[PDB]
Structure formats: structure tokens, C-alpha cells
Amino acid sequence: AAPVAFGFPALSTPGAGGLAVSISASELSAAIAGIIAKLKKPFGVVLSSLIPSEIAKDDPNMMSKIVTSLPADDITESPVSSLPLDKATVNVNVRVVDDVKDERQNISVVSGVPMSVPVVDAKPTERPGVFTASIPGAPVLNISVNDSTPAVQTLSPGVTNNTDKDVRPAGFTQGGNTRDAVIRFPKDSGHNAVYVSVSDVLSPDQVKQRQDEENRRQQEWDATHPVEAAERNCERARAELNQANEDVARNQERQAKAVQVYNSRKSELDAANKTLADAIAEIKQFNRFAHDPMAGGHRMWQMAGLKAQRAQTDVNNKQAAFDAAAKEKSDADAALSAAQERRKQKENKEKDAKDKCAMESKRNKPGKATGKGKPVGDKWLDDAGKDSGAPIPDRIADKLRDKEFKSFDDFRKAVWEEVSKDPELSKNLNPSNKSSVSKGYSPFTPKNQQVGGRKVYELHHDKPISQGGEVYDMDNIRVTTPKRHIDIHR
Amino acid sequence: LKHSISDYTEAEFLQLVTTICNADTSSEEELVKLVTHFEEMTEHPSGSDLIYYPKEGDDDSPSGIVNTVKQWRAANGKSGFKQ
């Protein structure tokens, strides 16, 4: 039962008796500690990438799961020992979770938010030093401690070990096929509590599905966080530019290199072409002795024959090589034109982006409220789902004007707070809804006006912020229901 | 940590609906996460409206909503609470 190193994802084919895992006592390597330390100061770092094509070569049935394990104390702030026996869920600082990024399913170490997991006790069994944790939704996970044999990292053609350990933002759908738990042993065993996540291996069809769902959630988040959706592009548009610039540089190297090779091969040829002319004159010289087979010359002639076929073959070889160099040089010259055209487009992209990144940055910098708004009725919030939405109400404008707000986010919170206190605007809000408006938050819409995760009334602008339109101008602003706004822009 | 309404006891479920109605959250994003979660447990057609846009004469206080979900689910062939 050679033990698998902590923090190194491996396949365990299940049995009828559940999964088989064998841990060690020996503490987790510099690597993972590194990651968890790095990661300490939702984002995450990829341990592995999965390739179903391969996993099936050995596990054709696709029954195999992917287990990964850590010693609980490295995850949890409160030692598992000093924890009530009534608690089913201990809080954790990081988790091991399946994510889907760049078109492969992959196992990875997540963090950056509040997280907390099942805690389950491990019943013992006939076998000596072998217990059964059963985590809801996984198979029976029968464990086995071993500090006798030196630790191993298992290597399976399906599961890869992605070197790039950059912290990247993590999946919205993270964990969608994972079940983890801190598992504790009974007190008279002396075995440390161990963390285990157990993830399904998604098939490529299922991965495209997660991928799709992942992209859709990203859209939502992008429309409900303009503040910094833009600030993200500016990174992608700057990265794409910095990369494209290097492309020019590497092309220049190839093309400046092709110019010398051209020049060199060109002169190699010239020389070799003079040598032919020399030898071919030398044969003209002794041409005389051509039909006198018993003369000094009819050797000296034959000799020139040879000098020439040699000198001639040489020319043929220098020519191929020169042609070839000429080809390379032409292709190279086009590679820059093409590659350097790419930089011009990428340099335009990064301008557009950086302009938008500063206009969409204004809505996160202070200002004074302005405008008059317009009269409204009892059906104020009803209007937010008709026409071009409902406007800010006059009565609200009046109460807010000239006041200073640290950020437009605060201006919304405040608009709703003047709606909660106004009986006629707030006539449409319920007790449960009113709890949200006065707590700041945007009030919820009817179901029929909701769209996925956008379930609450939105403040938008007519003349957008990205087209320099005033952030805080209440004649500008429009209350809309998620659906209504979505419809408005099509 | 809870995929079916049958993971919740009646008194456990009530707590979630009393969290949501009072808006007892650290952020609007965690509130909306709770409501989106509530919706899925109920499988109910009104959806979020059970809380924020109740029918005429329904009870919209935390309990009455637990009560609406309870009898609806039972009356349309659906699993019940824990216990």
C-alpha cells in the first residue's frame, strides 16, 4: 500500500468496498506548502489537468475518480482537535476542487473566500490501521495510514502536472463534481485528521457543458460589475500587445538573420561561378589537343574536363542553397509585414481599452448628484419593466441633489434608502423587500422580470459612462428590471 | 452543502427563509445566492415571489412561506422535509 503524497492528485479506481486510498504521516512537500502560503496572501492554482481520452485507455468504464489529500491542520485555522463533536462542518482556508479552464477539466487548490466542509469520523475495520470514512455523495472512502514505506507520487497518462503555478481567478462552477471533507480518526488511534477531496472525471461532452456554463456566468458577472470588467480587458489587451510586440522582435531576428544568410550564400555562389568560368576557359585553351590522343595536351585537356564538372557541380549546389536562402528571405520579409500588422491592431485594441478603463473608473471616484428627475406614480417599479424603463423620481432627485458620494455604488444604496422612506414609491415593496432597501441592497423584482442571477432592480445610464456620460446625473439614470434592460439592448 | 430540500428539517429550512426575509447577510451577493438557493429547494413556480411578491391572502412572514412550500410540494407529488 505505497502511500500517495499529500497534495498530488491521482486516480483511484473504486471497488465494491469503495475507494482505496493510502496516506502517509510525513508532512506535505515544500511545493504544496509553497502554494498554500503563496495562495494565503475566488482564486486558485492548478495542480493537474485531466485528459479523459487517456484515462480510459486504462479505465475504459470511466469509473475512476480523482483523489487528492492534505493533512487537515494546514487547511483549517482552528485545529480539528479543539473542535466540538456536534459540528459537522469545519471552516477551511483553501480547498481542493475540480475546475474547468482552457478546455480541460482540472483539479486545483482554491481560496480567497469563506469556505467550510463536511467533517466525518472514520469507523475502523477488521484490518489493522484501516478505517472507513463515508463522505456524503462519494463512495465509501476506506483509508490506510502508512509511515513505513517511503512516499510516492503516482503517475497516470491521463492526469498531468501543470508546472505553471500562477494564481489565476477560479471557476464560477468550481467544485461542481467534487466532494470533500476533513476526516477525523477516533481518539485512541493517534492518526492526524486528514482532508480529502474526491472529484469525478468529466467526459469531454461534460466538460464542454461546464465550459459553456462557465462562460455564461462570466457574462452575467461582467454586466453586473462594469467597474472592473473593463479593468480586466485592459489586462488582456495589454498582455496581447506585449506578446505581439515580442512577435515583431522574434521576426526581426529571423529576417535580419535571413539577410546575412542571403548575402553569404550569394557570394559563395559568385565565387563558385568565377571558378567555373576559369575552368571553362582552361578547357577552351587545350581544346586543340582534343582529337590528338598522344599529346601532352590531351591529358591537360581531360584534366580541365574534370576541373569543370567539379566546378560545375559546385555551382549547382551553391545555386540550390542560394535559391533556398532567397526563399527564406522573402518569407521572412512577409512574416514581419504580417506580424507587424498584428502589432498595429493590438496597439489599437490597448488604446481603446485604456480609455474605457478610465471612464469606467470614474464611477468609482467621488462626485455630486445632479438633475431633477421626473414625476412618477404608484406603478413606479412597474414602469421599470416597460418602455425605456422608469426614470429617477423628482421627489428622490430633490432629496439627493448636491450631496457628495464616495462612489456610484453608494449613490444607488442611497437612492433605494429614499425609496424605502417614501410610502408612495415604496407602495409596491413588501415587508421582506423593505428589509433589503433599508439595508442598502437593491430590491428584488418579480420572477417574470429576473434573468439568471440578475434578480434585482438595476440602475443603468442612458448616455453610457464609457461614452463619457455623466456618472451621477440623475436625468441620465434609469431604473430597469434585469429583463427590461436586456430587451432594451438588442 | 445541501442539494435537496430533504436535506433540511422543517426548523432548519425556516432559518434560511428567516435569514432571507430579514436580509441577514454580509452582502447583497450572498443574499441573492441564498434566494437562488431557496428557489431550487422549493422547486416552486412563484419562485422568488413567495418572499417578495406573495399572492393575495398568502402569509409572507417567514413561517407562512415555509407553510406554503410544505403543502404545495406535498400536494403535487414531491419529497418532504428531513424526518
Author numbering:
A (entry chain A): 85 to 125, 132 to 580
B (entry chain E): 3 to 85
Authors' description from the paper:
We therefore switched to using a disulphided form of ColE9 in which Tyr324 and Leu447 in the R-domain were mutated to cysteine, which has been reported previously. We obtained X-ray diffracting crystals of this disulphide locked form of the ColE9–Im9 complex in the P21 space group, and the structure was refined to a resolution of 3.2 Å. The asymmetric unit contains four ColE9–Im9 complexes, two pairs of molecules related by non-crystallographic two-fold symmetry. The final model of the ColE9–Im9 complex contains 488 residues of ColE9 (85–580) and 83 residues of Im9 (3–85). No electron density was visible for the first 84 N-terminal residues of ColE9 that comprise the intrinsically unstructured translocation domain (IUTD) of the colicin, consistent with nuclear magnetic resonance spectroscopy data showing that this domain is disordered. As with other colicins (ColE3 and the pore-forming toxin ColIa), ColE9 adopts an extended structure with overall dimensions of 130 × 75 × 35 Å. In the present structure, however, no additional electron density was observed in the HNH motif, suggesting that no metal ion is bound within the catalytic centre. Our structure for the ColE9–Im9 complex, only the second intact colicin nuclease structure after the ColE3–Im3 complex, shows how the conserved scaffold of T- and R-domains presents the E9 DNase–Im9 complex in a different orientation to that of the E3 rRNase–Im3 complex where the Im protein is sandwiched between the T- and C-domains. The result of these differences is that the DNase domain of ColE9 is rotated ∼90° away from the T-domain relative to ColE3, which is emphasized by the 12 Å movement of equivalent Cα atoms in the structural superposition of the two colicins. The lack of an interaction with the T-domain explains why the affinity of Im9 for ColE9 and the isolated E9 DNase are identical.
Notwithstanding this diversity colicins invariably have a similar domain arrangement, where a central receptor-binding (R) domain is flanked by an N-terminal translocation (T) domain and a C-terminal cytotoxic (C) domain. E-type colicins parasitize the vitamin B12 receptor, BtuB, as their primary receptor in the outer membrane and the Tol-Pal complex in the periplasm. The catalytic centre of most colicin and pyocin DNases is the HNH/ββα-Me motif, a 34-amino acid motif containing invariant histidine residues, which chelates a single divalent metal ion that catalyzes phosphodiester bond hydrolysis. DNase-specific Im proteins are small acidic inhibitors that bind to an exosite and inhibit colicin or pyocin activity indirectly by blocking substrate-binding.
